[PDB]
Amino acid sequence: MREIVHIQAGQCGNQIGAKFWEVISDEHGIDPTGSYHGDSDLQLERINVYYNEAAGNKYVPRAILVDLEPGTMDSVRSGPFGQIFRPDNFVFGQSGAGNNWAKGHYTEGAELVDSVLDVVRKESESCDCLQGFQLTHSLGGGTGSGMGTLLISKIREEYPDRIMNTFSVVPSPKVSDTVVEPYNATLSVHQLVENTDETYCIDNEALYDICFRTLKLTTPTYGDLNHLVSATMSGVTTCLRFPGQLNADLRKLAVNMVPFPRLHFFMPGFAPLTSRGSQQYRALTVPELTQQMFDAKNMMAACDPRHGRYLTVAAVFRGRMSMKEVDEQMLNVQNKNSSYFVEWIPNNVKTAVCDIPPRGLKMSATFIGNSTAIQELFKRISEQFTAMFRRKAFLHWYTGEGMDEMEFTEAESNMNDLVSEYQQYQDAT
């Protein structure tokens, strides 16, 4: 029961996805061949949430890999764990999107979308009770952004009563990784606001900072960034897969964290994070974990929670720990930092505890914050969009694919409205 369908779009989407699948397999004691070599019955009890059981005692990820070019796919296939995936679940094009949202959403992506939908439907029909979908991708490219959004639109239409969640790698403030990133992000966001139930905003700037400052990694690799994200991802579904004391799931978390339908953009965080040398000098206690969670430097979105207010905050703990202690800690943060929490939602902290900790650890924590500060990110994007759109820069790349200025305009307006909405609730008493 409560089977989840995983979908991966574009380079970033696929590279995160590979890491995530490596993590989950390790967690459930699954090796690169799909065979269970774990120790405990708890590892197999809820294996069906993420894996289909094939013939001859093998497990296969309920994972669909999508890209408009075949290089990343090939790499994944050749990677460690590449052979675990269903060959028929790789859906790849030959053309590419050329960092163009239009190509991903309307042109090349549109030529590929039906083929993906067919696989998706089949996967859905496998499951006894489909929980919903998790999509991993960036908003800055063409595939993950344009094609991903298209997929979201279609899947949601097909399955409107299932949960649609996304792990979106967002453009950073300091330096862009693409010239047209504001366009691609802007178009994506318009789709996301209407078609997803929850969206975890993840930003590479934050990740690098975490790696450098907290993990003490002089030379982080993209792999190391990915691992962090995967750890967060696994944390969010932990209570669905393992018994605990107070069980959460995807629906409950949404309900607790989303008071208004459009305000479903979260800022995730993970704890504990320590260097190899610096871990022996600390104690892994609940309060310490809490403190690590509730700071600004440990948020994976490039916005300071101290610049806004928390609407709702979900804390998910993994490990054998005291419920009383947790309650005390959660209460404490609310009491002492009263000014950072919206006053018209009392007890706006939601807690979940799963008894099974992650590997290597006695205890761990995952933080989901719905903060009005995320509006800053949107504002930046709007500004950047404006600067370019006012001069119609690069616009012929999109109009050449059949798109009109009207669509752009509407997108811009919608984004602005979302920002306004956030501002309104920030200021409300």
């Binding site: 030959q94 010239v179 047209v180 012929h396």
Partner: protein, 432 residues
């Protein structure tokens, strides 16, 4: 899968091609006979036997330069039908290239291209090597581009062009050829990467400590840049860029499609030691005007797009850091309509070095493709050159004799005037 087909036109195009294909072979471990003792496949087609053939066409209107290929070290590397030669050259005359002589072989060239493309499963497009100044490089290339646009169209076409210098010429009629070919090719090309002989020569002397650089050296340098551009397709990488993306990221307006290429580090064995060569260090080097491969001043222009292609032992965080600091720097100004100016590629494979080459082996390299309003200076200069000669109708009789009409000179000129004004307009900051 992601095939890419190379076309080498005239002496410059062919000779650069020789350098490029020599490098490609070394990079993929392909011998001069086509033998190797899977990624190479984007550039080499494969036979039933263990033999690999370049996805290339070499064209020249005279036999001499191609004859060297035929009789040289890599005679067995190319299939005879991919080495195409006429009888008489275009004699530094665009007219002869585009009309009189070119119309006799265009069909043949295109036929071979069609056959090449037939054996592609995912053709990304074309890499065209030529020069602005020669009759073939100017006239034939323009013709070819017209035909390619008609027969294919949406396939991304990229040009590498030996753009003529301010104070270092080879022919007298260079400005005419340059102007006409630019006019005729403009609406048919998606992006054109300029490189200047003077600049490269200067670099060779200053940075590589070479007293007397040869054309070979310049060709070798060019090859490196080509490799950087295509390494994302020929190897696996962390963060990738595929030929279609460059056009998206570097061309803000259809006419403004002339970026410039810069490579770093270019050093010798004596100077390869004695320094660590970090990502920050090479990135900074790239921006600085002395390492540029076009004789133009970016300090007097504004950047509209930068694409940075890193290769080898490179760390993404470090790149990000390097870029951030360059953003702050006073000497780098970007146009006001472009808050996000960087597209970044990172590839795992270090730049491979040709045995007997002038460059030292490094752990990291970077190739910047940057589009700058400063390049408008060159256009102005070229226009001025055209004006001086055209006012007297100097050499014009040649062109008319080969079937060109004098009105077309004026037409080309006005088009270039327009282009110059487009750049100027772009330059200015937004009102309100």
């Amino acid at each position: 899968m992601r095939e890419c087909i190379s076309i080498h036109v005239g002496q410059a195009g062919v000779q650069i091609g020789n350098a490029c294909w020599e490098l490609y072979c070394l990079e993929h471990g392909i011998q001069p006979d086509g033998q190797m003792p899977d990624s190479f496949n984007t550039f080499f087609s494969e036979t039933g036997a263990g033999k690999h053939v370049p996805r290339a066409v070499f064209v020249d209107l005279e036999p001499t330069v191609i004859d060297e290929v035929r009789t040289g070290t890599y005679r067995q590397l190319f299939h005879p039908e991919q080495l195409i030669t006429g009888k008489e050259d275009a004699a530094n005359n665009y007219a002869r290239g585009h009309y009189t002589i070119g119309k006799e072989i265009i069909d043949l060239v295109l036929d071979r291209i069609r056959k090449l493309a037939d054996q592609c499963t995912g053709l990304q497009g074309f890499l065209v090597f030529h020069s602005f100044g020669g009759g073939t490089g100017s006239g034939f290339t323009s013709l070819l581009m017209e035909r390619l646009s008609v027969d294919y169209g949406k396939k991304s076409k990229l040009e590498f062009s030996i753009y003529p210098a301010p104070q270092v010429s080879t022919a007298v009629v260079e400005p005419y050829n340059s102007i006409l070919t630019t006019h005729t090719t403009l609406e048919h090309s998606d992006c054109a990467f300029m490189v200047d002989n003077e600049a490269i020569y200067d670099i060779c002397r200053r940075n590589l400590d070479i007293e007397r650089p040869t054309y070979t050296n310049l060709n070798r340098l060019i090859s490196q840049i080509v490799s950087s551009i295509t390494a994302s397709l020929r190897f696996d990488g962390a963060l990738n860029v595929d030929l279609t993306e460059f056009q998206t990221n570097l061309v803000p307006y259809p006419r403004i499609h002339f970026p410039l290429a810069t490579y770093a580090p270019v050093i010798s064995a004596e100077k390869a030691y004695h320094e660590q060569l970090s990502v920050a260090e090479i990135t900074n080097a790239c921006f600085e005007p002395a390492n540029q491969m076009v004789k133009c001043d970016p300090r007097h222009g504004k950047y509209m797009a930068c694409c940075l292609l890193y290769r080898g032992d490179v760390v993404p965080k470090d790149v990000n850091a390097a870029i951030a600091t360059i953003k702050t720097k006073r000497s780098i100004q970007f146009v006001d309509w472009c808050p996000t100016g960087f597209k970044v590629g990172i590839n795992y494979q270090p730049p491979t070095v040709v045995p007997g080459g002038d460059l030292a082996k490094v752990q990291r390299a970077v190739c910047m493709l940057s589009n700058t309003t400063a390049i408008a200076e060159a256009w102005a200069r070229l226009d001025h050159k055209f004006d001086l000669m055209y006012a007297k109708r100097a050499f014009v009789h040649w062109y008319v004799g080969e079937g060109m009409e004098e009105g077309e000179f004026s037409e080309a000129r006005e088009d270039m005037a327009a282009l110059e004004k487009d750049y100027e307009e772009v330059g200015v900051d937004s009102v309100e």
